RNA sequence: AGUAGAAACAAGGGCCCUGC
């Protein structure tokens, strides 16, 4: 016999089985050629050749906004924008939502930008440090930038976001910047270029669209302005109904379902609808920051004179960005025995020993190039502006005209970033075709393209949107979320409850069936036992833990009360997935065991902080890596150790520093001293302290105060 | 004691340094928070991979050193290692150890005197367990389920508070010496603080853990979920084991957690004071605020002020709305027209004037909105999605489950939109006496028709007839509605569609500051009325338990 | 949150909020000044004390 | 007053609003972005084309008024110079997919599946580790009877493989599973064949001209053809294996309501059906062997070790008659060897080497990479024995994912239970046993006719599909499975009379066929997709032959 | 101190005080009494003819 | 040798250290 699994698609639907296709049971698969190709495609899509010269950097500046030329093969992408059309679309969207709409949104945003503290820049994905020129986490990058400010001119007294932004602005006009290193200083031009730089990271954690194989990482002099723009963009996007970017899960499904009911109820007897599943292409390579600058200028037109100046920064900084070529080419001989390695700044030197492909791809981008960076004056990169792009995209789905109504035609739909669904309505196929072409035209006037291979259409109820297939029902693929049924990777206390919670939410939302949930529960339990090298008592496994387990097991009298990490069996099921095991077993442990486990003085317990779990001896922390032991990253560990010493002392005196954030008018030294003297009296009055000890303490403290105030 | 002296010596050594002195001198204390981030920052991409690859080592865990010596935890108990003298790179005051060491502690380690305090630290989860044990399951059955999506609460919680009222409560119960000035919430809720304090005092505890758990004990976890059947926190907490799209695990869970009883008590009290204050003619505003602040009520064990519960609840009812409005409490954007509930999805408009003749010629002004708007609407067990256009009910879809509810929902929508000729030429039955002014207070023609419908069923039948009736076209036989509320017929009403399957309640995490008039009708930055006193029941007698109306009236 | 008026309403009487709000509207100043005025106004009020 | 001000100050400090911004003095009432000198110089330079200073652009945007007519004119103009094609599939049908051309795609999985032979013994709980089982099997004497000869049936470098096998036996005999670094092991483990670095600062033109140092010429893979041995593997991995319990599983918790009884019952039936197949023993083999290799790689890097390829199972349960309580079994399929897995960083590579036992001679097309030897004889009567040998690699990621190969069960159970509950709900009755014993599913074709069998027996096809997805996953399979949904959506639209259409279908087919290269699973599934649309064309339109 | 269904008994006591206060000895809600009386036996019934 | 994909691995730092 010959086997063919696809044959099951004849006598069955396809959505109710589409999850079977996803190969998510195996590992997903893991430069400069890529970045150079991206730079090239960006310069090409701008279908123009006009150029100016920047008096600042003295580099040719391709201007791609309102300069369309080369109007052939528009089916292919185009990255030129007609600001007039853009503003027309924005005005129609405002008219739909009512007046005073954009003003209200910028007001809500400004209400937050002002009170925000400048330490919320520590939270977020990696950033590109501009001193060592490498990717540090966001916390460390912020620390280093602040340290540079302080060592150059004076300590940063600021405490809010606006003050940090003003300091950044000023730093673009200094003339010599200092910073620490194994205390180098630099000039203005070099630092300017080093600030506008942008780097790339190959994380692309989610599989999703295989096209995503990189992500951007701007510096720390560009982070606060980007946050400002994104805050206003979010405040706008949440209000619209034709957008699905901020929402998640049941929300976007409910949106689609109400949309379909509304559509079927509106259209008359002589009209029929059609749906389309679209996937725009080259999304981050056609979005232009100049159009964003014009649009943000139109939005913040009636608001305060402060927002008009803040929102306009991130656009110009992205209008003048430099990109980073990574790791350069590699040279080698025939046998491949030897091998020379070369970097970006040098590829301009050995440009004759490279493949003809690199030469055709590199020499054209040789004038835009500077030392190991390229001056990309437009385009975009992944992840930079998602909500703003969704707003710009949703402005189209709102279009309406006299011609569309003279024929009784109208479209709607729903868009998240570069992924949309369209619902066209008309009375005849000649007009369905005409409407679809009209939509495509209005989208081309502002750089929103459409992929002709990945896009398809059909009669009303069959479409897809972000891996969610829709028909009369909704097929929760349930393979999209399969990888999550694995030990999270925190500690023993947590992982089992975390896994049970994931199974529960799936049963509620994605319609995972009962028996499947039981199977997933058993599989996760086995994987947990395998990870932490532990097994039941009744089993015969040998090894480190099982040794002491079997040794002391005799002291127990009710094994039903043991924990899984101690050779315990499973007592949990579908109807008790919302209950941690420590709670489900507490009434049966042995007082001896129970008290030795839930003891607060453990050399192991650490708190993590969502964290719906119980804390006990099993809540440990793993060792810290040691590769750095060899790397000469120790000078930086020094300053970290200093901050840690200060903080742990302050907390030693005040126990609620972590729970309740401190406030007050004292500095830290003042508060510490005052509290120590107060506690000394409080004890010496009644508690076990002598006048000799009290006087010694007071003398120590006064000397410490003298030293603190004397150093400077 | 000696520890205090050690802390003093540590502070001195630290001040001897130069940078530490500058950082402990500049700015206020808030900097602590900032410094807490610049240190110990390190993450990992795939913690699962690194857990299976880290636990495969010899000494993968860290642990305290002095705590192990004091506990006399040996090394190499039975030829199996437990730890070794070293220094983790980050802490520098911790020592590597192995997982087996944890088991050693749990089996032959130091024991605390008692640990029943745990049941209090984790009251919410032992509460889940206890409520579960008192459920009586039933057979399991298979069928399709009508799951509507909506926002609900999943955590049964007594005395739901705000966040500012917890951050302080976490201090007077745990860190009292470091407590701030007494806030109003404390001085008022004294017994509550005393209660939480009696349990966690003179006990061996880790306090960070206890503080986090208190935040969890006072949080109604609000979620946007698909839902079926009654809506009660006791069910929503275990919805996963009651039904899916194709099955139902029958079980009776009616007598547990007593939540909605408190809410219905609160609404009864609110209706009482609203009507009382309405009895006035010139001070209903100040009268109402005074009646509110002059009242109290019992919740479980504690005594709470009414004005404090009203600013904590989320009952979108035409009574709670008025009170929350008098007290300057912000609220959600949900409308209310009589018994039904409403929520706007899109559209706009503005007021416009029109007139109608009651009997013969008697001009009476009534307003309407001049634009198109789209609305979700909710009556008992029936949902609808409709649209109005310039004094007309353009279209409507329904997803209810009863004929009576379908007819009533359709009728109240027609009234809400001023659709029909009756708004063009009122019926003979109504007169100037029934018009308005029980005692002088006028009544817009809308609520006039409303009560005219609620009076007799035949008025409702006539109003539905006001809607065009036609012959059921082919194919549409299933999606059609007669006058009785039947899913199909030969002749059905005009521009109406039925369906099985409720409509998804819209959602918006928005808040609005409204106000009200001397007639107790709230407005929202527009001529639209979100609440009033004509949309609530006429009257009824009730015996309130554990209430205090310490006010003369 | 979501507006300075809502913030100020946390520790002021809603009446003083409405007063300071009408005032800032009269002068047309940045509405982040709802707070100072309400505070100032309330002090003056509680200084009268009947 | 002082009390009120104290409360207010606490509130503000808590909200971070106790600053000059919100509580200014008379003077500091003008907060503004400090527009510097360089930034202004840039902003007036980043402007769109028609404008030349930010002031002009701001005045044009702040006063912009809507002119719907010019907008409609530009929209229509753009709508005319585009000419977007619209193609109803019924009129423009889909050609077939064109697989590449060349030799056949050979076996690629690390372990053998159909040709694998195993030595079995009974398991005693005391000796349970791998390094021990490998010795117990060595004492009984069969593992030592093996002795290949210098003449291989096929392959290359036979001398190295022979010496390495002798060293493996020697190391096992010394009770220390380690191997020394000699010329043979060094050559097979690729020990010293990592490139040597040459800094450029020390480089010159004479050096280049001395030894050509051109840029490395990446040699992308070359194509292959449809594998004809894949269908055989699929049919062999569907049958029982004479034993069971190959894949370890946890216990069932208690139950309190009918729901949990239902859950336990269905889970027991399905697991009992699947635990007996051959696909299951291959999963168990992968689980345990990769677990062993992962531990070794963690503890003993920089040291060549010896790891067995084994599995544990339990002989089936006859009736109460005869010897009750069937016993357990340790099975051994071959030997494996690692080589200095210094996984300093993820995605790295540590070569390993595989010596396996078989009783079926090879084929040049399929077993291309192997180097087979004639070993000797083994019983069943006497039958020859062969020794398949090769070299390959793994990494942290493949280790982690292969060890977690029990996900296939979750997916398979999901599909089956969904079908059963959907059929049971439409009738409001337990049609689960009926739906498993009666509802028939097409499996394949034989003698030009279709074949069908109950759901209870069709589970095995889906299980094997999921296991193969776990094994052969790569970027090629990724792209293919990503591009076939467009075709299935077209098919469903065809089944339901929804007049589908598309904008450029030829481009879709090109994208699909771009990712078909030398991957047995992709090639197999492409041939089967062509056959699906062919078989359905007898019942639907939109597909060309 | 020792018991099986504390929540039902407690809520039912509250309902009793409520009934007595209202001068009517009846208890309207039937959730706790129903449970505590039906814990012994309560179930469906299938006709023999439909078997 | 081998792996993998559109670039990387086939140890890396100072005889000793290590595996995000």
Curated annotation (Swiss-Prot), chain A:
Catalytic activity entry: RNA(n) + a ribonucleoside 5'-triphosphate = RNA(n+1) + diphosphate
Modified how: Phosphorylated by host PRKCA.
Region Promoter-binding site: start-end pairs: 223-230
Domain of life: Viruses
GO biological process terms held by the UniProt record: DNA-templated transcription; symbiont-mediated suppression of host gene expression; symbiont-mediated suppression of host mRNA transcription via inhibition of RNA polymerase II activity; viral RNA genome replication; viral transcription
GO CC entries: host cell cytoplasm; host cell nucleus
Gene3D superfamilies: 6.10.140.720
EC supergroup of this enzyme: transferase
Enzyme Commission number: 2.7.7.48
Pfam families: Flu_PB1
Start and end residues of each RdRp catalytic domain: 260-456
InterPro entries associated with the record: RNA-dir_pol_NSvirus (IPR007099), RNA_pol_PB1_influenza (IPR001407)
PROSITE patterns per the UniProt record, alphabetical: RDRP_SSRNA_NEG_SEG
Location relative to the cell: Host nucleus; Host cytoplasm
Keywords: Eukaryotic host gene expression shutoff by virus, Eukaryotic host transcription shutoff by virus, Host cytoplasm, Host gene expression shutoff by virus, Host nucleus, Host-virus interaction, Inhibition of host RNA polymerase II by virus, Nucleotide-binding, Nucleotidyltransferase, Phosphoprotein, RNA-directed RNA polymerase, Transferase, Viral RNA replication, Viral transcription
Recorded GO MF terms: nucleotide binding; RNA binding; RNA-directed RNA polymerase activity
Family the UniProt entry places it in: Belongs to the influenza viruses polymerase PB1 family.
The protein's name: RNA-directed RNA polymerase catalytic subunit
Swiss-Prot record, chain B:
GO cellular component entries: host cell nucleus; virion component
Keywords: Cap snatching, Eukaryotic host gene expression shutoff by virus, Eukaryotic host transcription shutoff by virus, Host gene expression shutoff by virus, Host nucleus, Host-virus interaction, Inhibition of host RNA polymerase II by virus, mRNA capping, mRNA processing, Viral transcription, Virion
GO biological process: 7-methylguanosine mRNA capping; cap snatching; DNA-templated transcription; symbiont-mediated suppression of host gene expression; symbiont-mediated suppression of host mRNA transcription via inhibition of RNA polymerase II activity; viral RNA genome replication
Entry's localization field: Virion; Host nucleus
GO molecular function: RNA binding; RNA-directed RNA polymerase activity
Coiled coil, from the record: none
Top-rank taxon, per record: Viruses
Family to which the UniProt record says this protein belongs: Belongs to the influenza viruses PB2 family.
Subunit and partners: Influenza RNA polymerase is composed of three subunits: PB1, PB2 and PA. Interacts (via N-terminus) with PB1 (via C-terminus). Interacts with nucleoprotein NP (via N-terminus). Interacts with host ANP32A (via C-terminus); this interaction promotes viral RNA synthesis.
Protein name listed in UniProt: Polymerase basic protein 2
Organism: Influenza C virus (strain C/Johannesburg/1/1966)
UniProtKB/Swiss-Prot annotation, chain C:
Function: Plays an essential role in viral RNA transcription and replication by forming the heterotrimeric polymerase complex together with PB1 and PB2 subunits. The complex transcribes viral mRNAs by using a unique mechanism called cap-snatching. It consists in the hijacking and cleavage of host capped pre-mRNAs. These short capped RNAs are then used as primers for viral mRNAs. The PB2 subunit is responsible for the binding of the 5' cap of cellular pre-mRNAs which are subsequently cleaved after 10-13 nucleotides by the PA subunit that carries the endonuclease activity.
Residues annotated for Mn(2+) 1 binding in this entry: 40
Family: Belongs to the influenza viruses PA family.
The protein's name: Polymerase acidic protein
Source superkingdom: Viruses
Entry comment on modification after translation: Phosphorylated on serines and threonines by host kinases, including human casein kinase II.
Gene name tied to this protein: PA
Record note on quaternary structure: Influenza RNA polymerase is composed of three subunits: PB1, PB2 and PA. Interacts (via C-terminus) with PB1 (via N-terminus).
Localisation per UniProt entry: Host cytoplasm; Host nucleus
UniProtKB/Swiss-Prot annotation, chain D:
Domain of life: Viruses
Cofactor notes: Binds 2 manganese ions per subunit.
Assigned GO CC terms: host cell cytoplasm; host cell nucleus
Predominant location: host cell
Chain ranges for the short sequence motif Nuclear localization signal 2 (NLS2) as given in the UniProt record: 14-76
UniProtKB keywords: Cap snatching, Endonuclease, Eukaryotic host gene expression shutoff by virus, Eukaryotic host transcription shutoff by virus, Host cytoplasm, Host gene expression shutoff by virus, Host nucleus, Host-virus interaction, Hydrolase, Inhibition of host RNA polymerase II by virus, Manganese, Metal-binding, Nuclease, Phosphoprotein
PTMs per UniProt: Phosphorylated on serines and threonines by host kinases, including human casein kinase II.
Cofactor: Mn(2+)
Disulfide bond annotation, renumbered to this chain: none
Gene Ontology MF annotations: endonuclease activity; metal ion binding; RNA binding
Biological process according to GO: cap snatching; DNA-templated transcription; symbiont-mediated suppression of host gene expression; symbiont-mediated suppression of host mRNA transcription via inhibition of RNA polymerase II activity; viral RNA genome replication; viral translational frameshifting
E.C. code: 3.1.-.-
Subcellular location field: Host cytoplasm; Host nucleus
Stated family: Belongs to the influenza viruses PA family.
Subunit structure and binding partners: Influenza RNA polymerase is composed of three subunits: PB1, PB2 and PA. Interacts (via C-terminus) with PB1 (via N-terminus).
Name the record gives this protein: Polymerase acidic protein
Source organism: Influenza C virus (strain C/Johannesburg/1/1966)
Gene assigned in the entry: PA
């Amino acid at each position: 016999m010959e086997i063919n699994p696809y044959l099951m698609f004849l006598n069955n639907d396809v959505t109710s089985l589409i999850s079977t296709t996803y190969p998510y049971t195996g590992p997903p698969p893991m430069s400069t050629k890529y970045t150079l190709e991206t730079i090239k495609r960006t310069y090409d899509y701008s279908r123009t050749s006009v150029e100016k010269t920047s008096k600042v950097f003295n580099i040719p500046r391709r201007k791609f906004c309102n300069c369309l030329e080369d109007k052939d093969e528009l089916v292919k992408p185009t990255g030129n924008v007609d600001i007039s059309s853009l503003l027309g679309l924005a005005e129609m969207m405002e008219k739909r939502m009512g007046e005073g709409f954009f003003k209200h949104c910028v007001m809500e945003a400004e209400t937050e930008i002002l009170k925000m503290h400048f330490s919320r820049l520590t939270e977020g994905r990696q950033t590109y440090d501009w001193t060592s020129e490498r990717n540090m986490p966001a916390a460390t990058a912020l620390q280093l930038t602040v340290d540079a400010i302080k060592e150059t001119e004076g300590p940063f007294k600021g405490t809010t976001m606006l003050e940090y932004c003003n300091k950044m602005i000023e730093m673009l006009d200094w003339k010599e910047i200092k910073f620490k290193k194994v205390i180098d200083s630099i000039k203005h031009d070099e630092f300017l270029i080093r600030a506008l730089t942008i780097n790339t990271m190959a994380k692309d954690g989610e599989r999703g669209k295989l096209q995503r194989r990189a992500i951007a990482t701007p510096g720390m002099i560009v982070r606060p302005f980007s946050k400002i723009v994104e805050t206003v963009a979010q405040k706008i996007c949440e209000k619209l109904k034709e957008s699905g970017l901020p929402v998640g899960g049941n929300e976007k499904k409910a949106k689609l379902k109400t949309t379909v009911t509304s559509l079927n109820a509106r259209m008359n007897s002589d009209q029929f609808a059609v749906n389309i599943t679209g996937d725009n292409s080259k999304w981050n390579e056609c979005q232009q920051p100049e159009a964003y600058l014009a649009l943000l200028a139109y939005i913040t037109k009636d608001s305060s004179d402060l927002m008009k100046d803040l929102c306009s920064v991130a656009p110009v900084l992205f209008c003048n960005k430099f990109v980073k070529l990574g790791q350069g080419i590699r040279l080698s001989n025939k046998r491949k025995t030897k091998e020379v390695i070369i970097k970006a700044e040098k590829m301009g030197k050995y440009k004759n020993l490279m493949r003809e492909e690199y030469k055709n791809l590199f020499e054209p981008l040789e004038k835009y190039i500077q030392k190991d960076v390229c001056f990309l004056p437009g385009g975009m990169l992944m992840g930079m502006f998602n909500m703003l792009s969704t707003v710009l995209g949703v402005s189209t789905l709102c279009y309406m005209d006299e011609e569309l109504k003279a024929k009784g035609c109208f479209w709607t739909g729903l868009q998240s970033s570069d992924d949309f669904v369209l619902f066209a309505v008309a009375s005849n196929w000649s007009n369905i075709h005409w409407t679809i072409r009209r939509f495509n035209a209005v989208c081309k006037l502002i750089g929103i393209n459409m992929s002709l291979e990945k896009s398809y259409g059909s009669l009303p109820e069959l479409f897809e949107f972000t891996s969610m297939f829709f028909d009369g029902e909704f097929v929760s693929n349930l393979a999209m979320e399969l990888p999550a049924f694995t030990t999270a990777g925190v500690n023993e206390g947590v992982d089992f409850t975390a896994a049970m919670s994931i199974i529960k939410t799936n049963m509620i939302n994605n319609s995972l069936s009962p028996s499947t949930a039981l199977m997933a529960l058993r599989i996760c339990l086995q994987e947990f036992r395998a990870t932490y090298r532990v097994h039941p008592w009744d089993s015969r496994v040998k090894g480190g833990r099982m040794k002491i387990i079997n040794e002391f097991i005799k002291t127990i009298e009710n094994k039903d009360g043991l924990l899984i990490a101690d050779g315990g069996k499973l007592m949990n099921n579908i109807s008790t997935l919302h209950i941690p095991e420590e709670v489900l077993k507490f009434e049966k442990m042995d007082e001896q065991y129970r008290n030795r486990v839930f003891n607060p003085k453990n050399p192991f317990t650490n708190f993590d902080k969502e964290n719906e779990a119980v804390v006990s001896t099993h809540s440990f922390r793993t060792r810290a890596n040691r590769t750095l032991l060899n790397t000469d990253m120790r000078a930086m560990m020094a300053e970290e150790k200093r901050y840690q010493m200060v903080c742990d002392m302050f907390k030693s005196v005040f126990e609620s520093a972590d729970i309740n954030p401190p406030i007050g008018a004292m500095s830290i030294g003042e508060a510490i001293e005052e509290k120590l003297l107060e506690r000394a009296k409080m004890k010496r009055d009644i508690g076990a302290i002598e006048d000799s000890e009290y006087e010694e303490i007071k003398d120590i403290i006064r000397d410490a105060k003298k030293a603190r105030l004397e150093s400077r | 004691m000696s520890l205090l002296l050690t802390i003093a010596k540590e502070y001195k050594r630290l001040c001897q340094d130069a940078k530490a002195a500058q950082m402990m001198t500049v700015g206020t204390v808030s900097n602590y928070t900032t410094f807490k981030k610049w240190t110990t920052s390190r993450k990992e991409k795939n913690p699962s991979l690194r857990m299976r690859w880290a636990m495969s080592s010899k000494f993968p865990i860290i642990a305290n050193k002095r705590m192990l010596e004091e506990a006399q935890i040996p090394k190499e108990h039975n030829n199996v290692a437990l730890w070794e003298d070293t220094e983790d790179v980050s802490k520098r005051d911790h020592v590597l150890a192995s997982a087996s060491c944890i088991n050693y502690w749990n089996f032959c380690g130091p024991c605390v005197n008692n640990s029943e305090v745990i049941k209090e630290v984790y009251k919410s989860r032992f509460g889940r367990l206890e409520r579960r044990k008192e459920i009586m399951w039933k057979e399991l059955r298979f069928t399709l389920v009508d799951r509507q999506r909506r926002r609900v609460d999943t955590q049964p919680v007594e005395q739901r508070l705000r966040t500012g009222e917890i951050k302080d409560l976490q201090m007077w119960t745990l860190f009292e010496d470091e407590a701030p000035l007494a806030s109003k919430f404390i001085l008022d809720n004294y017994g509550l603080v005393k209660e939480m304090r009696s349990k966690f005092a003179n006990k061996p505890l880790n306090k960070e853990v206890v503080a986090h758990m208190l935040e969890k004990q006072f949080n109604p976890e609000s979620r946007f979920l698909p839902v079926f059947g009654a809506i009660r926190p006791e069910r929503m907490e275990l919805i996963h084991a009651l039904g899916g799209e194709t099955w139902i695990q029958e079980a009776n869970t009616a007598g547990i957690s007593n939540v909605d009883q408190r809410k219905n008590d609160i609404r009864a009290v609110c209706r009482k004071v609203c009507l009382a204050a309405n009895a006035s003619i010139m001070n209903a505003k100040s009268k109402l605020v005074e009646y509110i602040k002059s009242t109290s009520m019992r919740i479980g064990e504690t005594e709470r002020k009414l004005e404090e519960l009203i600013l904590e609840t989320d009952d979108v009812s035409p009574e709670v709305t008025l009170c929350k409005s008098a007290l300057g409490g912000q609220l959600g954007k949900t409308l209310s027209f009589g018994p039904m509930l409403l929520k706007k999805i899109s559209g706009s408009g503005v007021k416009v004037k029109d007139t109608v003749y009651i009997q013969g010629v008697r001009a009476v002004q009534f307003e309407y909105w001049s634009e198109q708007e789209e609305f979700y609407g909710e009556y008992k067990s029936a949902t609808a999605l409709f649209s109005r256009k310039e004094r007309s009910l353009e279209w409507i879809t329904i997803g209810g489950g009863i004929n009576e509810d379908r007819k009533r929902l359709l009728a109240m929508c027609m009234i809400f939109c001023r659709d029909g000729d009756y708004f063009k030429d009122a019926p003979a039955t109504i007169t100037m006496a029934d018009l308005s002014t029980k005692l002088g207070r006028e009544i817009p023609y809308q609520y006039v028709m409303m009560n005219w419908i609620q009076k007799s069923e035949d008025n409702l039948e006539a109003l539905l007839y006001s809607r065009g009736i036609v012959e059921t076209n082919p194919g549409k036989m299933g999606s059609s509605m007669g006058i009785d509320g039947s899913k199909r017929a030969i002749k059905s009403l005009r521009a109406v569609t039925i369906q099985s399957g409720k409509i998804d309640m819209p959602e918006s995490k928005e808040k609005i500051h409204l106000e009200l008039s001397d007639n107790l009708e709230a407005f929202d930055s527009s001529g639209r009325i979100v609440a009033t006193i004509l949309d609530l029941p006429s009257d009824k007698k009730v015996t309130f338990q554990d209430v205090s109306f310490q006010h003369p009236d | 949150s979501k507006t300075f008026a809502e913030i100020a309403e946390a520790f002021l009487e809603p009446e003083a909020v409405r007063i300071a709000k009408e005032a800032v509207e009269e002068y047309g100043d940045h509405e982040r000044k709802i707070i100072q005025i309400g505070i100032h106004f309330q002090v003056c009020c509680m200084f009268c004390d009947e | 007053i002082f009390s009120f001000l104290a409360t207010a100050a606490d509130f503000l400090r808590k909200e971070n609003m106790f600053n000059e911004i919100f509580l200014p003095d008379n003077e500091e009432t003008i907060i503004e972005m400090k527009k510097g000198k360089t930034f202004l110089e840039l902003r007036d330079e980043s402007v769109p084309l028609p404008f030349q200073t930010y002031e002009q652009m701001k005045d044009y945007c702040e006063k912009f008024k809507g002119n719907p007519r010019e907008l409609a004119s530009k929209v229509s103009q753009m709508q005319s110079n585009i000419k977007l094609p619209i193609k109803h599939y019924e009129q423009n049908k889909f050609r077939q997919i064109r697989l590449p051309k060349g030799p056949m795609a050979p076996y690629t999985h690390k372990f053998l599946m159909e040709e694998a032979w195993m030595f079995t013994k009974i398991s005693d709980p005391e000796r349970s580790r791998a390094g021990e089982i490998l010795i117990d099997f060595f004492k009984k004497g069969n593992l030592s009877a093996i002795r290949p000869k210098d003449k291989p049936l096929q392959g290359k470098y036979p001398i190295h493989y022979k010496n390495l096998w002798n060293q493996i036996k020697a190391a096992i005999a010394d009770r220390t599973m380690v191997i020394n670094e000699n010329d043979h092991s060094e050559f097979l483990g690729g020990i010293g064949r990592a490139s040597k670095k040459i800094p450029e600062i020390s480089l010159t033109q004479d050096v280049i001209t001395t030894e050509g140092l051109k840029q490395s010429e990446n040699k992308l893979p070359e194509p292959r053809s449809f594998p004809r041995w894949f269908n055989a593997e699929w049919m062999w991995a569907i049958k029982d294996s004479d034993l069971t319990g190959w894949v370890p599983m946890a216990e069932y918790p208690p139950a309190d309501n009918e729901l949990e009884d239902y859950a336990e019952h269905l889970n027991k039936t399905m697991e009992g059906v699947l635990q007996g197949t051959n696909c299951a023993r291959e999963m168990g083999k992968c689980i345990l062997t990769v677990g062993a290799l992962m531990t070794e790689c963690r503890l003993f890097p920089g040291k060549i070790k010896v790891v067995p390829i084994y599995a544990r199972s339990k002989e089936r349960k006859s009736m109460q008659e005869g010897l009750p309580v069937p016993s357990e079994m340790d099975c051994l399929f071959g030997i494996c060897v690692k080589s200095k897995s210094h996984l300093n960083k993820d995605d790295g590579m540590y070569t390993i080497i595989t010596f396996e036992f078989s009783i079926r001679e090879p084929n040049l097309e399929k077993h291309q990479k192997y180097t087979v030897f004639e070993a000797g004889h083994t019983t069943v009567r006497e039958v020859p024995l062969y020794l398949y040998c090769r070299t390959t690699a793994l990494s942290k990621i493949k280790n982690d994912w292969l060890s977690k190969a029990r996900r296939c069960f979750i997916t398979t159970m999901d599909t089956v239970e969904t079908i059963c509950l959907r059929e049971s709900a439409k009738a409001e009755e337990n049609l689960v046993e009926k739906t498993l014993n009666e509802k028939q599913m097409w499996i394949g074709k034989k003698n030009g006719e279709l074949i069908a069998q109950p759901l209870r027996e069709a589970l095995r096809v889906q299980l094997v599909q999921q296991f193969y997805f776990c094994i052969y996953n790569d970027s090629q399979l990724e792209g293919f499975c990503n591009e076939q949904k467009k075709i299935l959506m077209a098919l469903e639209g065809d089944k339901k009379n929804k007049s589908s259409f598309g904008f450029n279908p030829e481009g879709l087919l090109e994208k699909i066929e771009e990712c078909l290269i030398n991957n047995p699973m992709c090639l197999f599934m492409a041939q089967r997709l062509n056959e699906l649309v062919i078989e359905a064309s007898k019942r639907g339109a939109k597909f060309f032959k």
